[PDB]
Amino acid sequence: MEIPVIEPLFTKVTEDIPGAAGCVFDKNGDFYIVAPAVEVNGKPAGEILRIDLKTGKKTVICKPEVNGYGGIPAGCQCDRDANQLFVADMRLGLLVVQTDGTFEEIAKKDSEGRRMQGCAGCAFDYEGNLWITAPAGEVAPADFTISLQEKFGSIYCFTTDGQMIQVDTAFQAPAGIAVRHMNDGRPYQLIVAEQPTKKLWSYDIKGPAKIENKKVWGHIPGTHKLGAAGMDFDEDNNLLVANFGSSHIEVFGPDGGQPKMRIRCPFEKPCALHFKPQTKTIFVTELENNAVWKFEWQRNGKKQYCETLKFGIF
Ligand SMILES: [Mg+2]
Ligand SMILES: [Mg+2]
């Protein structure tokens, strides 16, 4: 059982973005990168940037900061009803960021009164609930910590009613995250990457912030220390998963298990992925060259929540 590999042509899009992680298309087809970077001394110096795709030129729209504590934004999703970005920050929690660069911190505490943990990945379901991974410890002003060895990583659901609910915990560095939907649009499965354990986990989604039947859903190949990072579904509900401790993007079928195909990259350390809406084009961030690339996949992406806005014919 050798896993078949393809080597499509990758094209460089932009470069020199230290930590280039989360990326997203907004409702105008503009492209954003979050850059969870620090300065030499270690002070957070996170950034959210917009990329001109015909030129690769970059524009910093936001340097998140709260009480002089800098952000480490890592993951991002675009909203549906308003063109605004929900941003998962490893120092600041969940931010909502306008295209005009202004932002709001969403929650200092969760629904049980606990201080919020720093967040990394997030995925809207089609009902507008945001599922979030939190591999960091408490948000600032607490000292930064990371569940790369100890199991204090957590999962949240930020519901359409405005509740920040912790739905599971005791993960070792949860990273990427995605929601599988049935053909009729109902959220069905939550998939969570547990980065250093090489596991992808699945839950049955029974409602807003109600998940159960947790199980190991997929295995990430590779012998290195870090496995899965970012992930996204294609329109057939194949899950593409950046394998950080490698030069590959893994492709799982709807049934999980072992990858049914691997995509070899011209670089190590793939981090985040995102389809361009209505195209087969996948954008990939990677931390060997701190750069962004694109390549063509075999079919279009699964529509993100922000693509599901509909309007009465009147
Ligand atoms: Mg649990
Ligand atoms: Mg993505």
Numbering used by the authors: 1 to 314
Text taken from the publication that reported this structure:
Recently our laboratory has introduced a powerful mode of photochemistry into proteins, namely triplet energy transfer (EnT) photocatalysis, by developing an enantioselective [2 + 2] cyclase that relies on a genetically programmed benzophenone as a triplet sensitizer. Compared with benzophenones, thioxanthones have strong absorbance features that extend into the visible spectrum and are less susceptible to off-pathway processes that compromise EnT efficiency. Here, we develop engineered translation components to embed thioxanthone triplet sensitizers into proteins. This system enables the development of highly efficient and oxygen-tolerant photoenzymes that are powered by visible light and can achieve selective conversions that are beyond the reach of existing photocatalysts.
To identify a suitable starting point for enzyme engineering, we elected to reposition the thioxanthone sensitizer to position 244 to create a larger active site pocket to accommodate the sterically demanding substrate 2. After screening ∼3,200 clones, an optimized SpEnT1.3 variant was identified containing six mutations clustered around the active site (P23C, Y37A, Y121G, G226L S271C, H287L) that achieves a sixfold improvement in reaction yield (78% with SpEnT1.3 versus 13% with SpEnT1.0). SpEnT1.3 also displays a high degree of stereocontrol, preferentially affording (S,S)-2a with 99% e.e. and 22:1 d.r. Notably, improvements in photoenzyme efficiency and stereocontrol across evolution also coincided with a substantial reduction in side-product formation, with only ∼5% of 3 and 4 formed with SpEnT1.3. Despite promoting more challenging chemistry, detailed characterization of SpEnT1.3 reveals that this photoenzyme exhibits impressive kinetic properties that are in line with the thioxanthone-containing [2 + 2] cyclase VEnT1.3, with a kcat of 8.7 ± 0.64 s−1 (at 100% light intensity), a Km of <15 µM and a total turnover number of >300 under aerobic conditions. A 1.8-Å resolution structure of SpEnT1.3 shows how the active site pocket has been extensively remodelled as a result of sensitizer repositioning and the mutations installed during evolution, leading to a substantial increase in active site volume. Molecular docking of (S,S)-2a reveals a productive binding pose with the ligand occupying a tight binding pocket lined by Cys23, Pro36, Ile72, Met90, Gln195, Leu226, Cys271 and Leu287. Similar to VEnT1.3, the quinolone ring of the ligand lies in close proximity to the mTX sensitizer with its carbonyl forming a hydrogen bond with the Gln195 side chain, consistent with a reaction mechanism involving energy transfer from the excited sensitizer to the substrate. Mutation of Gln195 to Ala leads to a fourfold decrease in activity, confirming its importance to SpEnT1.3 photocatalysis.
